[PDB]
Amino acid sequence: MFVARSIAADHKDLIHDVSFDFHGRRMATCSSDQSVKVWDKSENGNWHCTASWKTHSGSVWRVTWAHPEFGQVLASCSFDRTAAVWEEIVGESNDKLRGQSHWVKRTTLVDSRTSVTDVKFAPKHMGLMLATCSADGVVRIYEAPDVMNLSQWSLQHEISCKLSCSCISWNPSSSRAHSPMIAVGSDDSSPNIMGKVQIYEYNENTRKYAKAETLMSVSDPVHDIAFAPNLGRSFHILAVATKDVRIFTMKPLRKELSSSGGVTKFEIHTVAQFDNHNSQVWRVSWNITGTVLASSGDDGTVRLWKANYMDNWKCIGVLKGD
Amino acid sequence: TVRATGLRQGVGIEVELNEIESRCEEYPLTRAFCQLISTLVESSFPTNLGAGLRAPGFEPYLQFLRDTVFLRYRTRAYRRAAEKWEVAEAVLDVFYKLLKDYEPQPEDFVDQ
């Protein structure tokens, strides 16, 4: 029996995203009220708002934690066309300012021409990198060259998707046999545009991200995308939130030694398609092992999906808020 | 290395070999050119050779050495009977160097 717990988020408007820290002891929430809030889990399992500040001049669409090796770093993105990076200064602020002051805005990334719809830190083995996607159809990848100086972020890569970008996912695979990959989703409502999920692979020879694949079977608007954590699989798994939940496996085809600079070709299979929300699916998230998928939709439910030992995916749980 | 459609009178080493050295029955320039190419191939092989002027690569030099120098060396007159072999050695040294360091890659079998 899953126990739902209400948290009085005290946001003045709609909450767009919730992100846990790497240890699952802190969470960040972001809202149309232009604010980010941080919440800490006490030993009794209660949640307490430990920081609340205005971050942006428009609705905050996403919030993400960096890996704890880079310290206590948050990124937020917004309708105001910016992404902001925040660092928590852990220090003795004398016992009178426990309300709001330990999060410092280190930078504002302003290169995007329209709404920045999603923001994701890269896997830690790539360094302190931040991807942003914008409705202008561009993914921008920034790097902080010095973790001690989070005020400086260099634009390393610009990826033209040629579609309005809605969501991004880094492939978390630490395998040196796999070039760094990014999946990009599009919320474009045009029925004439097939392939609203695009996969980009970093090509070492060109020092650029090149389009490896396009999921032509995904013609519906994409609201969220997530690569599953790769704990020793010879293939990738991608979840896609659209009118339904889709799960794709992507097996890299062995590079025939004859294409001296090609992107990796993938053998792609749809291993699951679930219409059980009977409505649009807004979010998809993998467990840390990449074995259980959570999805949320307009049906007001969170659904849990898991493969059995025959690779048959099933709904294993439904959580409903009261 | 660049053939423009309209000049029927080539300027350069290929005409000096066919009109000047062939009349003198002595081939010092052709051997010195083969020696230059032999030394340049040993010290640096540029993949982008001729990029922007023509299709990149070594093929125009290989065609001159193969078709104009090597395949014709026997049909030429030589004032010194030994120089016939000096020309053959100088071109074959280049071919040996070009093949020695070459390893077949999958990329070589795809039309770029």
UniProtKB/Swiss-Prot annotation, chain A:
Main localization (coarse): nucleus
Keyword field contains ATP-binding: no
CC per GO annotation: cytosol; GATOR2 complex; kinetochore; lysosomal membrane; nuclear pore outer ring; Seh1-associated complex
SUPFAM superfamilies: WD40 repeat-like
A molecular-function term among this protein's GO annotations: structural molecule activity
First and last residues of every WD repeat: 10-49, 55-96, 111-152, 160-210, 217-258, 276-315
GO biological process terms, semicolon-separated: attachment of mitotic spindle microtubules to kinetochore; cell division; cellular response to amino acid starvation; cellular response to nutrient levels; mitotic metaphase chromosome alignment; mRNA transport; nuclear pore organization; positive regulation of TORC1 signaling
Keywords: Cell cycle, Cell division, Centromere, Chromosome, Chromosome partition, Kinetochore, Lysosome, Membrane, Mitosis, mRNA transport, Nuclear pore complex, Nucleus, Protein transport, Repeat, Translocation, Transport, WD repeat
SMART domains associated with the record: WD40 (SM00320)
Summary of activators and inhibitors of this protein: The GATOR2 complex is negatively regulated by the upstream amino acid sensors CASTOR1 and SESN2, which sequester the GATOR2 complex in absence of amino acids. In the presence of abundant amino acids, GATOR2 is released from CASTOR1 and SESN2 and activated.
Compartments in which it is found: Chromosome, Centromere, Kinetochore; Nucleus, Nuclear pore complex; Lysosome membrane
Transmembrane segments: none
Function according to Swiss-Prot or TrEMBL: Component of the Nup107-160 subcomplex of the nuclear pore complex (NPC). The Nup107-160 subcomplex is required for the assembly of a functional NPC. The Nup107-160 subcomplex is also required for normal kinetochore microtubule attachment, mitotic progression and chromosome segregation. This subunit plays a role in recruitment of the Nup107-160 subcomplex to the kinetochore.
Family (UniProt): Belongs to the WD repeat SEC13 family.
Subunit structure: Component of the Nup107-160 subcomplex of the nuclear pore complex (NPC). The Nup107-160 subcomplex includes NUP160, NUP133, NUP107, NUP98, NUP85, NUP43, NUP37, SEH1 and SEC13. Component of the GATOR2 subcomplex, composed of MIOS, SEC13, SEH1L, WDR24 and WDR59. The GATOR2 complex interacts with CASTOR1 and CASTOR2; the interaction is negatively regulated by arginine. The GATOR2 complex interacts with SESN1, SESN2 and SESN3; the interaction is negatively regulated by amino acids.
Name by which UniProt lists this protein: Nucleoporin SEH1-A
Source organism (scientific name): Xenopus laevis (African clawed frog)
